[PDB]
Each structure stands twice: as C-alpha cells, then as structure tokens.
Design a protein around this ligand. Structure first.
Ligand SMILES: CC(C)CN(C[C@@H](O)[C@H](Cc1cc(F)cc(F)c1)NC(=O)O[C@H]1[C@H]2CO[C@H]3OC[C@@H]1[C@H]3C2)S(=O)(=O)c1ccc2nc(NC3CC3)sc2c1
Lengths: 99, 99
C-alpha cells in the first residue's frame, strides 16, 4: 500500500517461521533483526551506524514475508534496538519513495 | 519525483546557506548532518542508533531545501557517517512509501 511518514513506517513480517514487526527503512542498505532464530550457517560481520559499529550474524538466502509480499535475501541478526527492513529486501517488493 | 531503491536515495539539499547531499531516510525520526555550520543557540542531545549513542547539537526552526522543496524544522549536527533527512522533514515535503 501507500504509507505516510507521520508515524514510524512499521509493518508486520514473517521470517524463520516467526512473526515480528519491522521498520521500513530506506536509509538501511541491509536488513537487520534482533531476537530471531534462523537455521543454518552464518558468518560474523561488523556493521557501522550512528554511534559506532556492532557485531552481527550474517544469514544468506533467507525467505521473508513483508506486509504480505515475498522476498528472499540476506538477513543480519544482532542487537539493533528496532528491526529494520533495508533496501536489499525493499527492492524485491517494489518499494519506492514519492514526493 | 519518484525514487527507486536500487541505489541509496541521495538528494541535494541547501541548509544554512550551504549545499550538501543527504540520504532520504524513512527509518530516521530526526534529521542529522555532519560538518555544517548553523547560526545561533543550540542544546546538547544524545541520540541512539546501531552501535550505540552519539552526542549532537540540536538546532531548532532551521530552514532547509530538499530536492527543491522547502521545509523548516529541527536539525541535529554531529558525527554521523552520512547526512540523513528524517521524518520530521519528510512529512513537510509530502514524502511517502509505496509498494
Ligand atoms: C537504526 C535506525 C533505527 C535509525 N537510523 C536511521 C537509519 O536509516 C541509518 C542511517 C545511516 C546510514 C549509514 F550508511 C550510516 C549511518 F551511521 C546511519 N542506517 C544505518 O545505520 O545503516 C547501517 C547498517 C544497515 O545496513 C547498511 O547501511 C548503512 C549501515 C549498514 C549497516 S540512525 O542513523 O541511527 C538515526 C537517524 C535519526 C534519528 N532521530 C532520532 N530521534 C529521537 C531519539 C528518537 S534517533 C535517530 C537515529
């Protein structure tokens, strides 16, 4: 749908068989969740943001459903204070900015 | 314009008489610039992001031009890795998400 920005643009997602809420985040290259449990192998990665860097687990080729749309791609797991859907997934569901 | 997300959604802005580039960032509540020089009084603020907290100067009622569109609002100044236009400004220029 269309989403305005008067509130945080939070949507419901399903990932790894679990239900979560996440912020649609055009300022994020990648997608990051806290407190989810994904199957399989992963690789450690350091990512940078406001206030410095944080250690995450990188999982590849993870299916995700984002407000009803299917995507597959890399998901980072680490201590973000809010779950974020980044451009690697947003491009797959046809998300654009408009003004 | 409409902006797709295959690349970072960077736009040109004018703020405090200076020209900068900045990321349209729907995951940002506030607007944050590195190395601009704004006039007048400000107050210290700590903000949180990925990897922790950072100290910023808070300037209020600052005029900004975002991709040709006029807004006025709070601008935070501090050591962000990339300049970010947040929802406090995006709502003023009619920015929405669409998918
Ligand atoms: C984490 C989000 C929930 C918030 N943020 C916005 C995101 O869009 C950032 C933007 C950014 C992009 C960069 F390139 C580098 C950066 F430092 C920052 N994205 C990011 O950190 O991305 C990371 C990771 C994700 O994937 C890749 O892409 C880039 C890298 C990389 C790995 S913010 O900046 O912390 C922010 C902004 C305004 C604001 N106002 C406030 N006000 C009140 C106290 C409520 S709190 C507050 C917080």
């Amino acid at each position: 749908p269309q989403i305005t920005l008067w509130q945080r643009p939070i949507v419901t997602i399903k990932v790894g068989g679990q239900l979560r809420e996440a912020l649609i985040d055009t300022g994020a290259d990648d997608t990051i969740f806290e407190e989810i449990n994904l199957p399989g192998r992963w690789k450690p990665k350091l990512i940078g943001g406001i206030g410095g860097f944080m250690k995450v687990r990188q999982y590849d080729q993870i299916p995700i459903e984002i407000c009803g749309h299917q995507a597959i791609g890399t998901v980072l797991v680490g201590p973000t204070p809010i779950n974020v859907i980044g451009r690697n997934m947003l491009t797959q569901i046809g998300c654009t900015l408009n003004f």
